[PDB]
Amino acid sequence: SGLVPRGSQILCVGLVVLDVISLVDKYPKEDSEIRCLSQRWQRGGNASNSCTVLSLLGAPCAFMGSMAPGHVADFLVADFRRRGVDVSQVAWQSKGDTPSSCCIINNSNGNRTIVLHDTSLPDVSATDFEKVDLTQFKWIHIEGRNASEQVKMLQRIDAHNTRQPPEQKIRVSVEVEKPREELFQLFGYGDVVFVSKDVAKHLGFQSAEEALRGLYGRVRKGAVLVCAWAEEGADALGPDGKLLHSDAFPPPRVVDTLGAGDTFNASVIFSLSQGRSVQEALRFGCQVAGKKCGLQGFDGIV
Amino acid sequence: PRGSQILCVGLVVLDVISLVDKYPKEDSEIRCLSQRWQRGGNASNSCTVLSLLGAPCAFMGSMAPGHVADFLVADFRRRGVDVSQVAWQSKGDTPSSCCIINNSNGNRTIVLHDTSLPDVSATDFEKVDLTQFKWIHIEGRNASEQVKMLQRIDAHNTRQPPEQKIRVSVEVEKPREELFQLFGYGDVVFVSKDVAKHLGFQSAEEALRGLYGRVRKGAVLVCAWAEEGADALGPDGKLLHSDAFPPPRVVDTLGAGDTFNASVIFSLSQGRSVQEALRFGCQVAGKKCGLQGFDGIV
Ligand SMILES: CSc1ccc(C[C@H](C)C(=O)O)cc1Nc1nc(N2CC[C@H](N(C)C)C2)cc(C(F)F)c1C#N
Ligand SMILES: CSc1ccc(C[C@H](C)C(=O)O)cc1Nc1nc(N2CC[C@H](N(C)C)C2)cc(C(F)F)c1C#N
């Protein structure tokens, strides 16, 4: 690790997982031995994907998440470095496995069957976050996971900001992506709150407009709540009460939407960290995520 | 030392294992109980079991340099498996499999990523000093090349007294027509239940009686059949059977067939009768079925 200039990096806190994806002619019957058509090992995880996009956008970025020493972590660290991501804040654990998932894709109907990673590896704790020198960062994005610990991380960032002039305050964003009640306390933290379409629909909202008007009462004073809604584009709502919208920028052909939400989040964060307005950041998020949907992976998103 | 090692020729594959409570239905998401990496491949698993049984053993197979091969080589060396005969390739990736093991019944589902890594050739085998080995086991893969390897061993044996002859075993594990020429080679032929069922046989007894005509004169044909135990048939025409030794809780059968094969080979290499070797094979493979991996078999 070398010298990182003060207030230069965007940190994403969350999951990194090894996804082993196998394409098969037909779903294997239990207890059978089959050969796949093709296989690929990929680095996944919401915060992990957002770091890849931030590096491709030209932002110095860092990932913070748990990993256990071993060959799975070696593959993931080499893949983070292949995408220019700084991994010096990784919380190395002495117990548990580095997450790894198995995804079987049936080439005859596109069905995806997933065997998700085990929960043995401890999540990043508030005590792990206390050890991080914050001066390095201009923005910290947190993927909502172990909410009670992440609330203490957010309170530490808020305390840091009270002693800084407006120019050296660290901007904060949070993502509430899973419909887990424990995560809903995270709406009250951060300057920017991203809420997924899946969370909005599980809370009874049928559109991004409904979700933002119905959930704005939960954010802290001054915060911007953002909700992307696939082909329907994305909306944002700030303290002035004006609903902002951008239409989607769909590709000529949709080929891969995995990580489109992480691409949208990273692109909104990047645009706002560059001093752009919320309307401009919302449009930029739709532009980059729409372009990504027409490409396999993140190469060529620009 | 001369005639001290057992050589296993075949594949070495990285098995990326997920242990689950139940097999996932198509298009669903389930969470695994635990994850692990295991050095797999049929010949490779048989070397693990031979080293655990206390037999000096060597592996011969293709590998490509890289971090996955570093894990596999370190695992072979940790078990004292001799890797000096490995055919290192400059092209192709290390094969890897996603293995889903059902913890409630030991069922193992494997999705193999077979890479364009070149197989061990007859020219690679020509370079092997055979004096080192008392037994050579071949996992059926590139049959036309492996037939030349077997012919080289047969030619070597014609110039040796009975005490210095190398015993040979072959495994016909996949129902691929190209592999059926391998039945006519070796002193011991292992035929899988899957091959037997694909050729119309519904039991180990049916398979041995129906396929014995394919083995060379004097050979022993062996067929394991999961909970139904295993059978063997030699030149005297007497069918031999062993009941299985199932554990009270079956938790992992990945590599049970390789454990059975290695244990039969070990017992026969120690001078035991075919009946005793068949029982020993069932005993060790049955013990393995009640454990995750191969540790604790001894
Ligand atoms: C506005 S950019 C954005 C931001 C976050 C997300 C992800 C998030 C989970 C969500 O769905 O809201 C997606 C996108 N954007 C698209 N997503 C799409 N899908 C998502 C899955 C859907 N299939 C059917 C199951 C298809 C299709 C398109 C299409 F027009 F090309 C676009 C775009 N453009
Ligand atoms: C006689 S030892 C042996 C030798 C070769 C094999 C593997 C070979 C492919 C075959 O199944 O013939 C298996 C075994 N043995 C067991 N396999 C079992 N399988 C249930 C799920 C798996 N399925 C059918 C493939 C395997 C269950 C038991 C149970 F009784 F504990 C035992 C034992 N004991």
Write down all domains in chain A, each with its CATH number in brackets: 7-302 (3.40.1190.20)
How is residue B267 written in tokens? 């017992």
CA–CA separation, B154 vs B165, rounded Å? 9
* Eight-state DSSP code of residue A49: H
Whether residue B157 is annotated as binding a ligand: the answer is: no
Query: Where are the extended beta strands (E) located within B67-128?
Result: 87-88, 96-102, 108-113
Helix (H, G, I), strand (E, B) or coil at B152: helix
Structure token digits, residue A152: 């203490």
Closest CA to A67 of A39, A88, A82: A88
The bridge status of strand B5-9 relative to strand B87-88 is: unpaired
A219 close to A255: Cβ distance less than 8 angstroms: no
Element (H, E) at B137: strand B133-139
Question: What is the dihedral sign for C-alpha A176, A180, A183, A188?
Answer: positive
Does B98 contact chain A (CB < 8 Å)? yes
Phi/psi at B252 (5° precision): -160, 105
Q: Is residue A116 within 8 Å of A107, Cβ to Cβ?
A: no
d(CA A202, CA A185): 16
Helix (H, G, I), strand (E, B) or coil at A255: coil
- Using the 8-state DSSP alphabet, how is residue B92 labeled? S
How far is A82 from A64, CA to CA, in rounded Å?
17
Angle at B102 between CA A123 and CA A71, to 5 degrees: 45
| CA dist., res. A15 & res. A48, Å (int) | 6
Residue B112 neighbours by CB distance under 10 Å:
21
Ligand 1 centroid to A27 CA: how many Å?
Answer: 26
- A173 within 8 A of A195, measured Cβ to Cβ: no
DSSP code, position B82: B
Is B226 annotated in some ligand binding site?
yes
Contact A116, A45 (CB under 8 A): no
First to last CA, chain B: 25
Q: What is the resolution of this structure in A?
A: 1.8
d(CA A133, CA B87): 50
Cα–Cα distance list, A81 to A47, A52, A55, A74, A76 (Å): 15, 10, 10, 11, 9
Beta bridge partners of B224: B230
- State the sign of the Cα–Cα–Cα–Cα dihedral A80, A85, A91, A94: positive
Contacts of A74 in chain B (CB under 8 A): 67
Given the structure tokens 């007859």, which residue do they identify? B122
In angstroms, the CA B7 to CA B134 distance is 8
Which of A30, A67, A117 to mutate to test binding with chain B, by most B CBs within 10 Å of its CB?
A30
- Both tokens of A189, joined, read 């933290």
What part of A 50-79 touches B (C-beta under 8 Å)?
A: 71-72, 74-75
Give the list of residues 6+ apart from residue B34 with CB closer than 8 angstroms, or none.
A97, A118, A120, B18, B19
Candidates B24, B31, B98; nearest CB to A20: B98
B74 annotated as ligand-binding? no
| DSSP H or E stretch at residue B71 | helix B67-78
Q: Which residues pair with B274 in a beta bridge?
A: none
Name residue, tokens 């020729």.
B9
Pairing type for strands A38-44 and A17-24 reads antiparallel
SS3 B122: helix
- Cβ-based neighbour number of residue B198 at 10 Å: 12
Phi, psi for residue B97 in degrees, rounded to 5: -130, 145
Angle at A56 between CA A50 and CA A60, to 5 degrees: 75
- Contact status, residue A44 vs residue A76, Cβ threshold 8 Å: no
